[PDB]
Design a protein around this ligand. Structure first.
Ligand SMILES: N[C@@H](CC1CCCCC1)[C@@H](O)CC(=O)O
Ligand SMILES: N[C@@H](CC1CCCCC1)[C@@H](O)CC(=O)O
Ligand SMILES: N[C@@H](CC1CCCCC1)[C@@H](O)CC(=O)O
Ligand SMILES: N[C@@H](CC1CCCCC1)[C@@H](O)CC(=O)O
Ligand SMILES: *[C@@H]1O[C@H](CO)[C@@H](O)[C@H](O)[C@H]1NC(C)=O
Ligand SMILES: *[C@@H]1O[C@H](CO)[C@@H](O)[C@H](O)[C@H]1NC(C)=O
Ligand SMILES: *[C@@H]1O[C@H](CO)[C@@H](O)[C@H](O)[C@H]1NC(C)=O
Ligand SMILES: *[C@@H]1O[C@H](CO)[C@@H](O)[C@H](O)[C@H]1NC(C)=O
Ligand SMILES: [Ca+2]
Ligand SMILES: [Ca+2]
Ligand SMILES: [Ca+2]
Ligand SMILES: [Ca+2]
Ligand SMILES: [Ca+2]
Lengths: 481, 481, 481, 481
């Protein structure tokens, strides 16, 4: 009867569900974190460069930034090897021990043109210069300083093979200038001095990139490093960093022939429900119409295919075209080739999420629960459209926050970051130490009221409007009895 | 029909709402924070002055305070420029790079007269001296020390152009004495030594101000600095600081002619509803009477006008009268001219808040929500007058806290600060580390009971008295069905 | 009618309530905290004694303890004065500036007798010595070391004028030995060297006290210092400290003649309701019987009288008998004379607490609230006797905690401290960082379950059993309608 | 009547309950913690070895690990004695003062064989070497380096008397190599240099153990030390530590003859209910069937017996066979002999837990509570089987977390650790500082939704489905009235 068509479609998913759980552990090993954490804490937190305590994370002046380069990464990457002996002049070194350095770092940068901003008429004698915020129309393509080599010659975004980048305050694209690093300590050390001497950080500097990347021999894993040091147009500094691990070559002779052969099974397996599912979509137009459970049944397929192509289609031929392209003393473009990885990694996962809530309807046939799932199903039609009312007053304080503290407390800063903090307080966590220090009459009265209302309103609408309906429907499933 | 008069009044507000959202982003840029954070962490947290770790925030002795002045700000403000060359003897320098120093710092101070307090009769031989807490009748106008220059000559509050100030423990007004700083490092460095040598910090010193201010060339922004170092009458020290950014000249040739021309639209736009709304106020006396929604409809106008004048009326002619007044080597009074800014900034924002809850009644016409808004509308008549009962027992622990821990734990300190902590614990956050260390039999028994009752009473009254009414009214809107 | 007898009794309390609110602010000023915080952070957190970072709070070895004495307090108390000149050989100094040192410190100590514990028979050759935990029957009165001066001669508890003390692990009484400090730096510095040389800290040392005290000239306030450094019988060290501020002389010529004259009014005012209230107690035996509101009406009087005598009766004649007793170069006993202050301070406050909940019944006559106070009045008869059921399972985890983590995590430590942590987690706060590090299979499974049940049981019993009754009684006050 | 058989069985448990409460305090004293905390903070947090701040907990490089051994523990264990005199050449020393060192430390280690992993074909010329993750089939038994002494000769797991170990990433068994330490500072110091010189840490090193142990003369307590320093296969380092206190000799002449004589009473007392309880189990098969209260009545016995034997049966003859076995200059195996202690300690406690909830049914006969216990008894039949639905969506985010942040934030790391964090956030505690820094578009949207749903779903199902039933049953016990 049905049970054959019940389990058969289940048996697919029931078997299909284990497939990805393999990929999880399989495509990404569990200790991968302790790869970063090391690789992280090497180049971030640990200047001994002097008694100076300030690490990468804590940084202000530009000259420190110099002392950072030539004082840490310069000693981070370029330095001796395990035996100290046996004369390696071809691969001269890597960091230490179990990780391989490949290529050579690339320093990328932006700048904005002189007098891009007109000082108000009054001060025009008082001070000569102005450099305003970074923007496309404000970007500077003009050649610069003593013009020799690359970093003294502007280049187009498309000229380099690199892409744009997100960043925190201002998004950046292409390069104003760049310098690829030498593979030897000395010359790298030799440039930086010769590099500082010309001072291309003078003013108006905005984006500053440092890009190298490395390989792990042991578990094969392949990781990239982008250090972006922003400069606000107001004179400060914002440090930031991005560490992305990646597996490049898809084939590990041990476990992958199980995985990759199951990989092709996966894209085949969905190809089944690709067409199988559309048949009801084309044949029954309104039968699937107006079902949230069903309206979500498509999304899993929507996303999966996106993942499907981009891995092979985008990134497979990539992997090929780097062989000697990637290995030579020259530095590859590889970053953008991993751009999709992050793009992929999450959207790989996001699907996996929904895959469970698929089973949510199915294999719970048993108790009154199956009915008592309709209970929770009933509520939202009130609340799903209701939550605005709260969320309206919820944005209230949010925007009330920005305008008030936004110039002093950090946590609020933008509006996009300060929307969260008024969550993080509801669960609780506290900058309230320095809220007073911000504005004595306000920070109290904002906070005091907010925790009062929001934490005593969330009570109100939710719980009751939760409570009632269930009491009704559980009594309603009693009033069919 | 109505829909014409419905949308027309809406279209005003519906358009009016976007107007201010412009001002928000427009009148204050988003990165303004990263202006302070730099400008902050320069003069606060970062002595290298010796291996001494203690920054401004962590400070005790008076001689450190000296080592602070001549050791940090002295090197904070007065120091070299980007090229190090090209001979600037007119503007000799600013801090670094992208921020301009203007004027010159001013050190302001208070003191209290000798023997202002009568030691009890017994000890009168034991010790000679007494200086009691700062207060007006206890203030000292008497000339002091070797009398030369300004800071050895008292001045009246009105004599100087400055105003009073809030501060934490004691509010302060005017000046006992003052010294304007030199614009050169050396002479500033030269004074302080000559300044210490006379030791005008001897004892009884209470308020100590340091005031300079600076300008930002790049985005035009104009910021002021008040460092107040209090001295308790018990011998300690309280550091504190105030950083206020400001835009002064109202005209940025780029975006402002959009903003300022929309500014005049704004004050015009309210002028519409200024009179339009009073017509019903004068004609219908009792028709608007007794409506909370309507009773709040006035407040938005009440505040806005306050903001309206004070910006132009108070502060516009200000901006004018500083041109060469502000630029010359002499230091301006500008602080009070920004006093209203903070006064303004918030009260600008507070309105914006209410502007949303205006729409709260209007554009939700749709679901039973519009009715289900009457639900939440029903509750408070019980609770709004009820919340005292809690709040009564709520102050209980509060005042129970002060009398008990108030002499040992900091967090409680005053009553005004300790009213909050018994919130900050309900959401949760913890000094409970050192609560035991305060009083072993109490700190437990206060805390233990409090979290018990308050966190199990807030349950009680709220949720039920929330729950019921909705169950009734939702059934009442069912019992009109 | 009643309103005359209604307000008259009220007018007493209604006026009486303000009386104590004066005492609060009056008997204890608001800035008193910033007295300690200074006076605290001088002798606790701030060795510069070398580059060694370890302060008082962080301490291990005994020799550090030596370097603490002679390296900090030795420089804490004994050191120069404001002018550095004018030859004070009578009062040679105080700390700095605004606080007076009086008397001279006293070092007090305990020790336990040799071989107080019998090592098991096997090891008896392996190692010679044993010293067990401190206890009365294990206490050592035997004279000790080279016997000269005080600290080499035992003394009885009663011989010294001092009392016992609480402390954390073991309570202590009297003295094994003691040394009063010199008033001069040098000799104090001279002893300690001569003191170390004899090494009376050898082993078995348990309690170590350091006691001096100081006076504040300015606001008159009088503070005492007890530093107890425990030694566990296992070789460690436990630092601890006690700072008690006090006002001694009851008369400040300015504000006290208002306060003290109102003080005598207070003890008179209660003397009114002392007898006035007993009349109904004697005449009506069962009329007051079985009323919680009334059953609490006595407690306020119970405690107040306790406070009444002990201030004058215990501590007034004290204040007198210290005049030249307290001032002379010899050190007074004053500590115990302040013992009652803390004993008093709280029990002064605890009353004040209840004084509000007195008004709780009275001046709320108005809304249905007065009836709706009976609502909350109804609940507890279920819950007040119920809370055991939870509290039973609540102790469960508590004692489950001790036996499990108690030997590794600090936070649990005793049972008396670990009863709190399972609150502090419910509100939330976290050692959960090192819970895993303690026991990997447990710390999770304890924690995981606990937050599950306890935080999902507190839901259960409370809210519903809260909700229902009110829904009933509010409907019951509706069913009298 | 019943009351005789009611109390008699009670009187057993009612008396039995106190028995174990003795064991708690008795078998483990309260200050035992302050034994560890000292003994802990000696060898963990406190290098002065140079100005280098990095302690054991904060560690990266291998050479630091060397500087750790020879720089801390080398000075931790081996160093002078109280008198500095009286010539102890037999027991040469212990740490300090009140703790005895016995035996001598043992360094244990693992390694993995060369070329255990085949580098992909392409790079095979690029780099020569590979060492993959530790596993049994990947373990290396091959002899190593210059082969002399123990640590240059492999040994089997069974050859040594030691057992395997848990550890965090990889579990370890037996030894690749080992070296017992000398009892003298010098020779221990002498080896390490000679030890480093051979460099047996070269690469592929995984597990590194250091094992010594010590005795406490004073309270008799006997503690063991295992320091495991893991090496990831990716080049990092993971420090970790295990401190286990233990009492070995069961007889303390003072209090134990009360305890141990009550110990034999205990195992006798259960032997009563061992058989007494089985009689109803054999005679009534279905009468006990299907009672949760009764279904739990067996577990207490199930576990207790497990504890019963293993203490005497496993560990008693152990204690005997160490007398001169344990004392001699040679180092004993004692660790595994304490392996059961931890195994025992918890499972000793876990029983004690359930012992209370035994009384939960009994001595509450009194109020409607006894009936109102059936109320809470009613709920779970809905919820106990329900909690999956939540817990399903609960794992959702959990696994959604791993795949997303798992490569950057530490807190998530494995799946087994990241299941907790989504609790620790619900109660609240925050890495949300660096969540943004991980993935800007995700970390918000994960977090934002999660706190929304999970914290607004836990509301939903729980409270109502809690509320209703009680309202029904309390009305149902009213509808039997
Ligand atoms: N077999 C997978 C584990 C899960 C799949 C879902 C059903 C339960 C078992 C697999 O992920 C196991 C692993 O990767 O180690
Ligand atoms: N136009 C404003 C954005 C909001 C206004 C309210 C309606 C939705 C859109 C403006 O603030 C946009 C900006 O300042 O960038
Ligand atoms: N008059 C007191 C303030 C309170 C008393 C209670 C009624 C309201 C006013 C007094 O404490 C004021 C003061 O001490 O400053
Ligand atoms: N006699 C035990 C105390 C408890 C037992 C249970 C009933 C209440 C009293 C014993 O643990 C006391 C002690 O160990 O100090
Ligand atoms: C170009 O290279 C020469 C080589 O010495 C160097 O001196 C010069 O600085 C470079 N470019 C400029 C603009 O100086
Ligand atoms: C006044 O100026 C002179 C100039 O040298 C200086 O010496 C003196 O200290 C100043 N005033 C006093 C009171 O000393
Ligand atoms: C007693 O005083 C003398 C004075 O020099 C001192 O040497 C001695 O140490 C003191 N007591 C003992 C036991 O040494
Ligand atoms: C064996 O012992 C000798 C003794 O000096 C030492 O030199 C040698 O290093 C040891 N083993 C090896 C492999 O070197
Ligand atoms: Ca909560
Ligand atoms: Ca919380
Ligand atoms: Ca916290
Ligand atoms: Ca809640
Ligand atoms: Ca209900």
């Amino acid at each position: 009867k049905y049970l054959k068509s019940v389990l058969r479609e289940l048996v697919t998913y029931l078997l299909f569900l284990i497939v990805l759980c393999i990929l999880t552990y399989g495509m990404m090993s569990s200790n991968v974190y302790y790869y970063t954490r090391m690789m992280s804490q090497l180049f971030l937190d640990t200047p001994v460069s002097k008694t100076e305590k300030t690490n990468f994370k804590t940084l202000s002046s530009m000259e420190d930034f110099w002392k950072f380069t030539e004082g840490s990464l310069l000693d981070g990457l370029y330095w001796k090897m395990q035996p100290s002996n046996q004369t390696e002049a071809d691969n001269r070194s890597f960091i230490f021990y179990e990780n391989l350095l490949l290529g050579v770092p690339r320093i990328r940068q932006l700048r904005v043109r002189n007098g891009s901003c007109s000082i108000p008429q009054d001060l025009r004698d008082e001070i000569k210069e102005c450099y305003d915020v970074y923007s496309v129309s404000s970007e500077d393509r003009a050649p610069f300083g003593p013009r020799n080599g690359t970093a003294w010659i502007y280049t187009s975004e498309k000229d380099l093979n690199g892409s744009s980048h997100w960043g925190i305050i201002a998004t950046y694209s292409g390069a104003g200038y760049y310098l690829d690093l030498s593979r030897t300590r000395e010359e790298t050390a030799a440039q930086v001095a010769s590099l500082k001497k010309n001072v291309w950080l003078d003013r108006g500097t905005r984006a500053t990139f440092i890009d190298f990347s490395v390989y792990n021999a042991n578990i094969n894993l392949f990781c990239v490093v982008r250090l972006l040091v922003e400069f606000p147009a107001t004179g400060g500094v914002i440090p930031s960093w991005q560490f992305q691990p990646l597996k490049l070559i898809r084939y590990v002779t041990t476990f992958d022939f199980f995985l990759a052969a199951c990989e092709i099974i996966f894209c085949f397996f969905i190809f089944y429900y690709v067409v199988e599912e559309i048949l009801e979509i084309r044949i029954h137009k309104l039968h699937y119409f107006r079902s949230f459970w069903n309206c979500l049944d498509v999304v899993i397929v929507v996303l999966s295919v996106v993942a499907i192509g981009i891995n092979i289609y985008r990134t497979s031929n990539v992997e090929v075209l780097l062989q000697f392209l990637e290995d030579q003393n020259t530095f590859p473009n590889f970053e953008h080739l991993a751009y999709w990885q992050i793009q992929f990694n999450n959207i790989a996962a996001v699907t996996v999420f929904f895959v469970w809530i698929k089973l949510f309807k199915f294999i719970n046939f048993n108790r009154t629960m199956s009915q008592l799932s309709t209970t929770m199903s009933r509520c939202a039609k009130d609340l799903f459209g209701f939550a605005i009312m709260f969320f309206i007053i919820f944005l209230a304080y949010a925007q009330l926050a920005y305008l008030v503290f936004g110039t002093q407390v950090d946590d609020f800063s933008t509006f996009q970051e300060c929307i969260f903090t008024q969550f993080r307080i509801i669960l609780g966590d506290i900058n309230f130490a320095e809220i007073e220090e911000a504005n004595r009459v306000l920070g109290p009265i904002y906070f005091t009221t907010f925790v009062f209302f929001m934490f005593f309103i969330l009570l109100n609408m939710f719980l009751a409007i939760i409570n009632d309906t269930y009491s009704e429907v559980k009594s309603d499933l009693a009033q069919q009895k």
